[PDB]
From a paper:
In bacteria, [name] is a large hexameric ATP‐dependent protease that targets misfolded and also folded substrates, some of which are involved in cell division and survival of cellular stress. The N‐terminal domain of [name] facilitates substrate recognition, but how the domains confer such activity has remained unclear.
Here, we report the full‐length structure of [name] from Thermus thermophilus at 3.9 Å resolution in a substrate‐engaged state. The six N‐terminal domains are arranged in three pairs, stabilized by coiled‐coil segments and forming an additional channel for substrate sensing and entry into the AAA+ ring. Sequence conservation analysis and proteolysis assays confirm that this architecture is required for the degradation of both folded and unfolded substrates in bacteria.
Author numbering:
A (entry chain A): 250 to 777
B (entry chain B): 250 to 497
C (entry chain F): 548 to 696
D (entry chain B): 697 to 777
E (entry chain C): 449 to 476, 478 to 497
F (entry chain E): 598 to 646
G (entry chain F): 349 to 497
H (entry chain E): 349 to 448
Write the structure that this text describes.
């Protein structure tokens, strides 16, 4: 078996900096005593170089169009991540090593928890037909989980990248790292230095892990690093790694994600494979009323609760569960409504405004309400938000002190009327301090006394001249307006580029008035 | 004593990659001096592969009425979680004979302290007639207290979840993980990040620890997680878990 | 920057592998939005209008250069002057210096006599650049106050 | 106003600035605590009927509920002069 | 807790330990005791 | 100058020069804590008023 | 008496062409070029200070630069020196002060080798982003060059 | 009579020659000099000394500055004894009094 | 090699409670082999002390 291992040196394709080291320590091996623990770690090392993959690679798939359909039967809502991975097929299909060095197959997914990004590795690997290992760095604390240990230590096995190479079998595989942002650290080694040693283009060609002291190749292997936030990444690994900021799943892909992918898996898990149906209206109801995070995890757990309450009905009595579950029988399955929808009741309320902003948990409507009472010259915003709505409120009222003859206001209303503004808590300013034109028509509906009809949705901000500021995150608030059955949404006119992100089945109902001026907002909206 | 270990592997009913890995480590352990510390760490390694279970499972009784009467003979009036247990049995009565990826779920029990949501796992063990090991996770600072150390660390253990796999001995236990809200979350220590591997219902069967260091099949473990408040659970970890929100 | 150049070259490569016609492919600014998805930030360019009562300020921050707008409307009220923004009050102090210049020069531009007390002023700061780097755009506010009043 | 309220009517709700009664959460122990003292007429918001159906039978058969949309419907009941 | 002092799982003492025979007595102000612990161990209100 | 005051204050930057500026625009009458004050300079402004 | 000049500090954001100016200055004096990464925390106590009685990998990373460059007067691109100081036990040491100062640049005792190395006439380029978390026994006497955006 | 005298505190704007004032006392005294600059070291237990169980345990910066002199009397400088950041993790005021 | 350090003890390791720690460190020096990974800390200990 010493000569069998000597044949298996040259049988593999095992490269030239490792070959004379393997032959010289095998030359050390046959003359010394085989019962030794030094002989044990020697035979472990010269099992490890001849089991780890070096150049024996799986065949890369020669065409894109049969991988996209395997992605289309595994994940739905990540179209941009699908474009980034067939983008990697477009890079590796065209090149195939035409004097090219300086590769970066190093990809990251950061988003809300439970959006998809640890189940990509059972889909990317099925797509481009490469074998998969799911490497875990959840509670990896020491550096030596990836860095390994020296062979002078008794009991030495290599790092978990090399143990991943032990399980996957072939070189050029795919990796999914499980957690990055809460990869913790201690003394005697920070594992961010170990992932520096993994994830550099300078040292993907050579690795030099501290068990296999020769260079190792991490070049052809493609990486997924999975995290939830960008704040607690170690800043070098945040720096020299390609980040995809995954946006949260909202309802108009959640209706598809249930019926296509998530519901049939768990009614296969329950047992009613063809013996349960759900309406699309109950799926839409579950998302607007029962789920309030951006991931589909309690979509999975409460449609799982629909499936197992249907199994409880199907086993306590033999009656058929092939009844379809609509909106109003769903409360027998799931009990109390945990959350409540937003009512765009189309009768004109006197001092209200149809507000739109976005939570990080999806696009959610607001209702900014305001009254004017003849008091003093002061204002008070009382809706659990900061001063970024307060400066828009002073912007709105100092717009409305101009054009006083236009809207029928009294001559001294600023020092005569107290004005109070309520906002809901769903407006979260990190990119969206939104709904400024809702504040402006709340001031205009309070002071004039003329009602605001609820037929028209609104999104903007206020400059004091009478012009509007643009907004981001336009997709989730337009489909949140499409959720409530309200079809007339006000946008700034310079937000015309965001209609290309919306496909036509949502866009055919949404009567988008691209409106740049606040006087045009108050002329289009405010019911006399 | 290595010549018992081969047929202990063969009647243990291991899966094929971990079975070939344990037989390869047994071929390593055949040749060496048995007095070495490598011999005792590989002997502890093969021993820990044998007395963890792989295909040994207690039979789940499919009686809804026996489970309901044991749930009513230990607890009163906890209607959501008692309906949850009988519909978990209604899943497992229906899927018995259908080979699907049977992930037993991850229950979260929030509410005020003292409801009995925090020591329900003894009654859950009596109601399944499955074996029990409540796992101490009260304010743990150590991530390798959950996922273990490697065997290069000299007196290493695979964590308390695999120690529950020892002392239960079958592949479908109930684990009362106490005080999941009370885990410290910091850059120096965060074992809630170690809870994210072992409590994900699509990849618990690819749980790698650090001492067995193989994908261990944790689809059939009926995990129980407890908390006295909602918000101090980390934002990945509360998302993973069936929150049976039972109030005061 | 070179991350987004990486993404536009590979987005060119994706339609290269399904349409192989590219012996030459020129990309100007108009088909840039076909790549890279949503516009992340927005260019504060020239507003292309010659005459309305506001001006264009400047600032400098390590995010880069920008073309700030400072605007004010002189509403007929109590004579208060307040800032509207989440930056420092030295911008309002430079506005106060502009107020002393218009009180010292109330004749040559057709101002009313009691303009200091017959006009409420709110002064906009829409922005986030210059915390203490270059935190003064005082003649922009002086044109804003004089064109408002 | 110098006017007292009714003695058998306890109440719960949420206020917005127009006067629309927003619904509340966790009502079962609130209704049975109002049932526990000498109150058998409670004010609820209008859209807490979905929470009130989860509340059991003896709580709904002992007391009286009032589904309220606007706070003028509250103050039409509880101002004795 | 007497439901799990019989199965108290120490980090070093890996096998669960029996502590339910042990008379634990604790000392203290209520407000800086945590909420599960002040609900969990029997208060003896000793004033001045 | 009608509002400026040529002042002297000791700094850890050595000797410094001041332009103490006050306009007092008509409003609610409160003292505005402008110009990045310390814990004592509002007390000096209260002594002035 | 001042045979060696004080050493630079390129400061700026992460992403500027500090490697491009290092390759330019090594092309300027007609010199083979080495880049020193020092990317993570890079504990000099753990990885420089071996004292030769381990297995003995990386005998000082300056000497690992020297065996790669093969010439006695290279341009060392020292990078990310602001990332040196750690919040751990023995890991902040600032042991490159003995490397960089001219009063013991001519001699150089190594952590591994324990032999006085001739590190005379060795040019150094130190590039580090944020000026605050530099070790102060470097920037008390090193030069600094502002590279803005 | 008493071997210990009080210890100098130089304080002012940064850069008024205080390191060179210690160097000029070193040149007048014909005695060696070292300057350490604190603030980067965030630990008492770095300076006072961690135990030998840690595998890369180098000792403190103040005895590093004392051993770089190599003589039992240095004109020792403690630069930046006040400018310490908010992360007072292992509190170095007790060790910096206990070396003083 | 281990006698140049003792030359440094009886030339500049003069005080007795200081040198008692170095003497039982010298006792520990011939206990393990000087190629073990623990012995780096032990040799660095009395080199830094001496
Ligand atoms: N597009 C999709 N199609 C089908 N199933 C999906 C899709 N997105 C999510 N899922 C399912 O929802 C689950 C949530 O994804 P998950 O892998 O938990 O992401 P993640 O939690 O953010 N990564 P991590 O936080 O480290 O666990 C997946 O395991 C899938 O089962
Ligand atoms: N429905 C019930 N029927 C009978 N006894 C009950 C019931 N609910 C609660 N109890 C009792 O009240 C106790 C409350 O549990 P508790 O002691 O708080 O758990 P715990 O010790 O806190 N577990 P943990 O804090 O997670 O480690 C139970 O252990 C029972 O003794
Ligand atoms: N009062 C002084 N008279 C003459 N020369 C001076 C004086 N103060 C400083 N210098 C010069 O400045 C040098 C001292 O360096 P300097 O820039 O002051 O830093 P430092 O004060 O010594 N250390 P630090 O105070 O911590 O920044 C001396 O070598 C002189 O060349």
């Amino acid at each position: 078996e010493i000569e069998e291992l000597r044949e298996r040196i040259e049988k593999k394709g095992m490269p030239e900096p490792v070959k004379e080291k393997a032959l010289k320590e095998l030359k050390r091996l046959e003359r010394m005593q085989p019962g030794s623990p030094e002989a044990t770690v020697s035979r472990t090392y010269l099992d490890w170089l001849l089991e780890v993959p070096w150049t024996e690679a799986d065949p890369e798939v020669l065409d894109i169009s049969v991988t996209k359909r395997v992605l289309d039967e595994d994940h739905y809502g990540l179209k941009e991540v699908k474009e980034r991975i067939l983008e990697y097929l477009a890079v590796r299909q065209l090149t195939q090593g035409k004097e090219v060095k300086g590769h970066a197959p190093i990809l990251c997914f950061v988003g809300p928890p439970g959006v998809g990004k640890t189940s990509l590795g059972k889909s990317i690997a099925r797509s481009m037909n490469r074998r998969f290992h799911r490497i875990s760095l959840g509670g990896v604390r020491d550096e030596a989980e990836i860095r390994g240990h020296r062979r002078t230590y008794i009991g030495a096995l290599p790092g978990k990248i090399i143990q991943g190479m032990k399980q996957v079998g072939v070189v050029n595989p795919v990796f999914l790292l499980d957690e990055i942002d809460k990869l913790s650290s201690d003394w005697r080694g920070d594992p961010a230095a170990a992932l520096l040693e993994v994830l550099d283009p300078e040292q993907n060609h050579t690795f030099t892990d501290h068990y296999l002291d020769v260079p190792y190749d991490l070049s052809k292997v493609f990486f997924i690093t999975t995290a939830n936030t960008l704040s607690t990444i170690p800043r070098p690994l945040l720096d020299r790694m390609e980040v995809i900021e995954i946006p949260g799943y909202t309802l108009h892909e959640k209706r598809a994600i249930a019926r296509y992918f998530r519901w049939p898996f768990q009614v296969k898990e329950a047992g009613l494979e063809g013996r349960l149906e759900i309406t699309d209206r109950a799926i839409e109801r579950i998302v607007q009323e029962y789920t309030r995070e951006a991931g589909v995890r309690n979509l999975d757990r409460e449609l799982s609760k629909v499936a197992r309450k249907a199994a409880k009905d199907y086993l306590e009595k033999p009656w058929e569960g092939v009844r379809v579950v609509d909106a109003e029988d769903l409360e027998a399955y799931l009990g109390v409504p945990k959350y409540r929808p937003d009512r765009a009741e189309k009768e004109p309320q006197v001092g209200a405004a149809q507000g739109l902003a976005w939570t990080p948990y999806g696009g959610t409507l607001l209702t900014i309400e305001a009254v004017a009472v003849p008091g003093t010259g002061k204002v008070n915003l009382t809706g659990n938000l900061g001063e970024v709505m307060k400066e828009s409120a002073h912007a709105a009222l100092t717009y409305l002190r101009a054009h006083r003859e236009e809207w029928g206001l009294p001559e001294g209303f600023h020092k005569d009327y107290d004005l109070h503004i309520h906002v809901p808590e769903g407006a979260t300013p990190k990119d969206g301090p939104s709904a400024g034109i809702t504040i402006a028509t709340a001031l205009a509906s309070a002071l004039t006394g003329r009602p605001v009809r609820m037929d028209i949705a609104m999104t903007g901000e206020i400059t004091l001249r009478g012009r509007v500021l643009p907004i981001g995150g336009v997709k989730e608030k337009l489909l949140a307006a499409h959720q409530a059955g309200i079809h007339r949404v006000i946008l700034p006119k310079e937000n015309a580029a965001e209609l290309k992100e919306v496909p036509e089945e949502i866009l055919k109902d949404l009567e988008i008035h691209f409106v740049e001026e606040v006087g045009e907002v108050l002329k289009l909206l405010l019911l006399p």
